[PDB]
Coordinates of N, CA, C and O and ligand atoms in Angstrom, one line a residue:
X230 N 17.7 -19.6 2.5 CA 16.3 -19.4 2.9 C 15.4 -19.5 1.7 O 15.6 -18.7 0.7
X231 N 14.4 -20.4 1.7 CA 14.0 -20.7 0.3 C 12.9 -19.6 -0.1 O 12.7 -18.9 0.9
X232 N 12.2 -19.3 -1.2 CA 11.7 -18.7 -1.7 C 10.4 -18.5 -1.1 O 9.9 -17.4 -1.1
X233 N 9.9 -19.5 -0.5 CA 8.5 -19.7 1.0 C 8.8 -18.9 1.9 O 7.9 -18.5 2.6
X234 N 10.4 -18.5 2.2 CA 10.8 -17.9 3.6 C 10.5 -16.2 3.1 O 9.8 -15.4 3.7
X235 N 11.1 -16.1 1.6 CA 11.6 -14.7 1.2 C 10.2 -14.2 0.9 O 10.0 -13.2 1.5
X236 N 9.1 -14.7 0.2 CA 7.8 -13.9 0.1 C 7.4 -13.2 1.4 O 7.3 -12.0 1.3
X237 N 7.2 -13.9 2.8 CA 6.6 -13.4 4.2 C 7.6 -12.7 4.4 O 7.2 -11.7 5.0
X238 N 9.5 -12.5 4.1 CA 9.9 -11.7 4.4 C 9.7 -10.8 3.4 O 9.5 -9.8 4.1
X239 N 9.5 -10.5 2.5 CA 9.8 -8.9 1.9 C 8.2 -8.8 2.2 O 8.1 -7.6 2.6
X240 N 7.0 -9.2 2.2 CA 5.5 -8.5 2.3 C 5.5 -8.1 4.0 O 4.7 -7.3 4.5
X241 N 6.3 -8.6 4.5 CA 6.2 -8.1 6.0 C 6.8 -6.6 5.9 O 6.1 -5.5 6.1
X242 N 8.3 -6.9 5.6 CA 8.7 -5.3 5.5 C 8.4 -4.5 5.0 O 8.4 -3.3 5.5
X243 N 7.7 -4.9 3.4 CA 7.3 -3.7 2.3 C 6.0 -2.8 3.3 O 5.6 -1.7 3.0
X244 N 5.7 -3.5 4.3 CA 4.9 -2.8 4.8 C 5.1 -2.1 6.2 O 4.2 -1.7 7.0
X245 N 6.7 -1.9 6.4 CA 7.0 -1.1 7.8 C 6.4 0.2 7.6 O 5.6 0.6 8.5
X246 N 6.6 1.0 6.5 CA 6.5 3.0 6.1 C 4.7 2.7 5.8 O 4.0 1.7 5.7
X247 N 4.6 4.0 5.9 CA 3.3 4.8 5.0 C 3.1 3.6 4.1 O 1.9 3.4 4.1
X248 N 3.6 2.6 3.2 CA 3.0 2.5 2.6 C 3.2 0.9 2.6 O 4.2 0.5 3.0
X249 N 1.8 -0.1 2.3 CA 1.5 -1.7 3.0 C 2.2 -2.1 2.1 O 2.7 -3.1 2.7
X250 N 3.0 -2.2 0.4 CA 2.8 -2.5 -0.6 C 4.7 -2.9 -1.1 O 5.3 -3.9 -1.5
X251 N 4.9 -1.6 -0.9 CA 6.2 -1.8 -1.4 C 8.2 -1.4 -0.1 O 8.3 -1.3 1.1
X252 N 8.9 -1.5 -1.1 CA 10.3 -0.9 -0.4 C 10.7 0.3 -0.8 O 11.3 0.8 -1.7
X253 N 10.2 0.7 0.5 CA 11.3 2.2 0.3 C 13.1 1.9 -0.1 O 13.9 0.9 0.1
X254 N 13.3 2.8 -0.5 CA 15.1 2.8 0.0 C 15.6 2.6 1.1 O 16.4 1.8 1.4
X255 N 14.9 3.6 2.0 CA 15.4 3.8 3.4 C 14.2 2.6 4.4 O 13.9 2.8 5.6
X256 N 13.7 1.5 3.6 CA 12.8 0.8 4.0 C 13.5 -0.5 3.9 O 13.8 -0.9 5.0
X257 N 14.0 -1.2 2.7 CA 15.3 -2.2 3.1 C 16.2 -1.7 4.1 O 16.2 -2.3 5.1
X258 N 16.9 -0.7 4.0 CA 17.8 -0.6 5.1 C 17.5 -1.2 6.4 O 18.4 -2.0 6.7
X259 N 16.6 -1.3 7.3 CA 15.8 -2.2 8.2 C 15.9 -3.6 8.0 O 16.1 -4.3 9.0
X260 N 15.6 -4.1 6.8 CA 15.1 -5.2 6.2 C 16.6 -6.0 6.6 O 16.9 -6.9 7.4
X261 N 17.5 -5.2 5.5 CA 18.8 -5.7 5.3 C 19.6 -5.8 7.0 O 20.1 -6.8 7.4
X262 N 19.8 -4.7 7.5 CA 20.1 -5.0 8.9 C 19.8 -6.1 9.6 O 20.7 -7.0 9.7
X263 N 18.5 -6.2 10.1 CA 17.9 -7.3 11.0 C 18.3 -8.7 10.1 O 19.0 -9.6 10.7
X264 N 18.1 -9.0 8.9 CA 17.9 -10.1 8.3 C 19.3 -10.9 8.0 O 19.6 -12.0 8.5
X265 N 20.3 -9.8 6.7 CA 21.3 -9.7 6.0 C 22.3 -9.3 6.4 O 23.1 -9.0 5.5
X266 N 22.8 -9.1 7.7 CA 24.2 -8.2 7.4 C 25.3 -9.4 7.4 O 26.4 -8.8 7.4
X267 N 25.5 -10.7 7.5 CA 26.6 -11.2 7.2 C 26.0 -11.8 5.9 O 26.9 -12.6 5.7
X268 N 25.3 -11.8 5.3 CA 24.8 -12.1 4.0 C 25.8 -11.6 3.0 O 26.6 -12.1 2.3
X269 N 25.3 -10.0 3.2 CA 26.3 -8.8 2.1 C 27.3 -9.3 2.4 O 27.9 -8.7 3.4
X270 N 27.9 -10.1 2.0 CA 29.5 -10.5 1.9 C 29.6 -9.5 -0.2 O 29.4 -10.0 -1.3
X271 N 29.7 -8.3 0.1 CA 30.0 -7.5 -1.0 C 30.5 -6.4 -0.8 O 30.6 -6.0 0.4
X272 N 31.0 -5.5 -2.0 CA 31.3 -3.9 -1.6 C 29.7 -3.0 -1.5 O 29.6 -2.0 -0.8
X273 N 29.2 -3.3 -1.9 CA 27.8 -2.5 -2.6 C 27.3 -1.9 -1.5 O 27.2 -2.7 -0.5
X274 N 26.9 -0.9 -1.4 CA 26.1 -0.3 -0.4 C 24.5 0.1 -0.6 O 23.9 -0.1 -1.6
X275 N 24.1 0.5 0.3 CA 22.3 0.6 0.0 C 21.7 1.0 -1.1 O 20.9 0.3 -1.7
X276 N 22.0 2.3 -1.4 CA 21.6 3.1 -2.4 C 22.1 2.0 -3.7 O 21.2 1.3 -4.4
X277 N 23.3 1.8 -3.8 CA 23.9 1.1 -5.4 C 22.9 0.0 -5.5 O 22.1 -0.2 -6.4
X278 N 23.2 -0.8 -4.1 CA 21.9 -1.9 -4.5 C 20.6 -1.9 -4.9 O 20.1 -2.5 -5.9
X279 N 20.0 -1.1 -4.0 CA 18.6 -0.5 -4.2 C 18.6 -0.6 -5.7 O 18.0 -1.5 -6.2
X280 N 19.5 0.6 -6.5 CA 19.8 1.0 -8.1 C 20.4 -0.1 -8.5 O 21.1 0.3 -9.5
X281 N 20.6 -1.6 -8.3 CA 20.4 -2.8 -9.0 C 19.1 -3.2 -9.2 O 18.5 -3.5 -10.2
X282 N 18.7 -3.3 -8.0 CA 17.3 -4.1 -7.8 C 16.4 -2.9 -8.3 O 16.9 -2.6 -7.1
X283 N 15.8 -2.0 -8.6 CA 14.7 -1.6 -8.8 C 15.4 -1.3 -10.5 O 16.5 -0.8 -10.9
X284 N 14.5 -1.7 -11.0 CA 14.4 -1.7 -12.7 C 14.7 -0.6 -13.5 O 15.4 -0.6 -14.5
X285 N 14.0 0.4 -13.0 CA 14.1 1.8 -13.4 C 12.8 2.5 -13.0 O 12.1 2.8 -13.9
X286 N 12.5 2.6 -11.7 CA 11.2 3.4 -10.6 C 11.4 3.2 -9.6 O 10.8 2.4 -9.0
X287 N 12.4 3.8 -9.0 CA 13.1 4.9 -8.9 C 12.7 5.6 -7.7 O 13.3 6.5 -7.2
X288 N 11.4 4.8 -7.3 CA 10.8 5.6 -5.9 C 11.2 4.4 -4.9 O 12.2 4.4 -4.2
X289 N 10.4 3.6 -5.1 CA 10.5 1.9 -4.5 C 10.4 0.7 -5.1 O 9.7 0.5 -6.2
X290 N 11.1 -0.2 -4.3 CA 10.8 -1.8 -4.8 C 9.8 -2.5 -4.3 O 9.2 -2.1 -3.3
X291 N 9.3 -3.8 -5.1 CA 8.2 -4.6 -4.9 C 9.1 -5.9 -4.9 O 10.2 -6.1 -5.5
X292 N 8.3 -6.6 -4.3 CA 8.7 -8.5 -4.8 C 9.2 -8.6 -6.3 O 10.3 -8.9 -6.6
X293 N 8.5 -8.3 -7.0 CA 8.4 -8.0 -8.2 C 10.1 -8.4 -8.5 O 10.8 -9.4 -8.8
X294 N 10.4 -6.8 -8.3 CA 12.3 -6.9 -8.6 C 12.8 -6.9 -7.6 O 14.0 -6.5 -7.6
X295 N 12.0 -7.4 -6.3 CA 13.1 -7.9 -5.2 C 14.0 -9.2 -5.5 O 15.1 -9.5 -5.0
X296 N 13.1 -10.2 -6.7 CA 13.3 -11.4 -7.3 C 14.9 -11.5 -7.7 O 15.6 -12.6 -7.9
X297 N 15.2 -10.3 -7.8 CA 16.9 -10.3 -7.9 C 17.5 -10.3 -6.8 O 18.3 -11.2 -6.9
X298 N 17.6 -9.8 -5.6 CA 17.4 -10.3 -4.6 C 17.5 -12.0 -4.1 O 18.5 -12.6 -3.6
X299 N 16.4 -12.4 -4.4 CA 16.3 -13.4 -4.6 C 17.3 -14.7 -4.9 O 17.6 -15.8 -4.5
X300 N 17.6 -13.6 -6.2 CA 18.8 -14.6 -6.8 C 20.3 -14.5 -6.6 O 21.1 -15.3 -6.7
X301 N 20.3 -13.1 -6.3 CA 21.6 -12.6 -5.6 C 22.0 -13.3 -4.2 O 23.2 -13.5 -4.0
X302 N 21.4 -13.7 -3.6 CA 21.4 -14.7 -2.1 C 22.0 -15.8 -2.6 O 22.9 -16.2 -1.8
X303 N 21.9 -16.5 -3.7 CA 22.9 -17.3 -4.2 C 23.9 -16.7 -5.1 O 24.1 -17.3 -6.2
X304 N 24.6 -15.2 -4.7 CA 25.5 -14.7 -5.4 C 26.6 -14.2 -4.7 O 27.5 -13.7 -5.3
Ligands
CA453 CA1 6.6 0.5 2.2
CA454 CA1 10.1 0.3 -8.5

């Protein structure tokens, strides 16, 4: 799903919770279900991933370092 598909997906979800902007933790979880679950062909689970993809803040993710993400789809 090319990079056109992934922007409207992550700005759609980043804005399920309280907040229009970013991903919760427990805000991909949603994301990844509906979208990804034969995708995750891995061991990694929410939390671990999450703590790949977010840089070091630690609250939520943005597009920003969802970009690994991104690249992980071809991983
Ligand atoms: Ca949010
Ligand atoms: Ca962050």
């Amino acid at each position: 799903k090319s990079p056109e598909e992934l922007k409207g997906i992550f700005e759609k979800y980043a804005a399920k919770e309280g907040d229009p902007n970013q991903l919760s933790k427990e805000e991909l979880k949603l994301l990844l279900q509906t979208e990804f679950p034969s995708l995750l062909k891995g061991g990694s689970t929410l939390d671990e991933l999450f703590e790949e993809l977010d840089k070091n803040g630690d609250g939520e993710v943005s597009f920003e370092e969802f970009q690994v993400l991104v690249k992980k789809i071809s991983q």
